């Protein structure tokens, strides 16, 4: 936009969905998981014990409060899915978790409502 070609300007991606409008939304969701996955590589081995599903949640919450600390998210929510953790799923090795979070919004449009008044035309410029 400016100054002999100085600054990249837009931040919308080419999405037809307003839930995925910003590249902030797309990049954060993409790289919250790449930090979650690369960091929980022990969950594909390590055959299912009783506290397998608990040690992943507290591991998932711990590598997600590191993300709330540095400002990637705001007030995540991690919990094991209570409705889809069957034992028929567990014999197949499947076990589910829910990793809801909120992304930080970019300040896309700051709005300045500027007005010229004659209010302080008497407060100064007078004998007073």
């Amino acid at each position: 936009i400016r100054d002999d070609g100085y600054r990249l300007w837009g931040n919308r991606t080419l999405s037809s969905d307003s839930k995925w409008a910003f590249v902030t939304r797309v990049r954060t969701m993409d790289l919250v998981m790449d930090a979650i996955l690369a960091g929980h590589k022990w969950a594909v081995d390590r055959g299912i014990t009783k506290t397998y599903v608990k040690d992943v949640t507290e591991g998932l919450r711990a590598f997600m409060r590191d993300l709330k600390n540095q400002g990637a998210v705001i007030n995540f929510e991690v919990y094991a899915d209570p409705d889809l953790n069957s034992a028929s799923q567990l014999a197949q090795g499947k076990v589910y978790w829910n990793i809801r979070f909120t992304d930080v919004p970019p300040a896309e449009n700051p709005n300045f409502r500027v007005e010229v008044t004659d209010q302080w035309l008497t407060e100064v410029l007078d004998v007073a």
Binding site: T49, K50, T51, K54
Partner: protein, 167 residues
């Protein structure tokens, strides 16, 4: 009921029968570890359980019997296996077997006084690491401290603490 009493005992150490030389057996005394619990709003203690006590089974032979002497003090604890058997008679003649398979460490060998004309009795004692009592061929007790199991009628009483500890 019918008046019923033990009449005969037997001992199997490692499958070998001691059917000539065990004058006395002693099953382990199952005692729960009570703490007398007196607290607010009550005048008397109430004795909460805190787990089981340590189990010792002791038995005596009065011959030489290397087939029980060779299990003292091994590096492998819980390698002394052993079956204490009893036949409880009953007045009508229906003999009921009481069989107590147990496993542990033979922890003391006590050769007593050796007087010349007197019968000499080797007193042994094992430190019980597994204990199953069957009465009339039906499981009464099953106590395994490691892999914490306390079954009382086939019903494992420690399923409550097992899920709490994530065992």
């Amino acid at each position: 009921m019918i008046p019923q009493t033990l009449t005969n005992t037997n001992l199997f150490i490692d499958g070998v029968s001691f059917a000539g030389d065990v004058p006395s057996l002693t099953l382990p005394k199952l005692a729960v570890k009570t703490e007398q619990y007196r607290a607010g709003g009550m005048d008397a203690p109430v004795s909460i359980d805190m787990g089981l006590e340590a189990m010792e089974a002791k038995f005596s032979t009065n011959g030489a019997r290397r087939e029980a002497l060779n299990f003292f003090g091994l590096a492998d604890q819980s390698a002394f296996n052993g079956v204490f058997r009893g036949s409880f008679k009953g007045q009508k003649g229906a003999s009921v077997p009481v069989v107590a398979t147990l496993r542990g460490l033979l922890k003391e060998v006590d050769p007593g006084d050796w007087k010349a004309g007197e019968k000499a009795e080797f007193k042994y004692a094992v430190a019980v690491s597994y204990y199953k009592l069957e009465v009339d061929g039906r499981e009464v007790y099953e106590i395994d401290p490691v892999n914490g199991v306390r079954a009382i009628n086939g019903v494992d009483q420690l399923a409550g603490m097992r899920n709490d500890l994530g065992l």
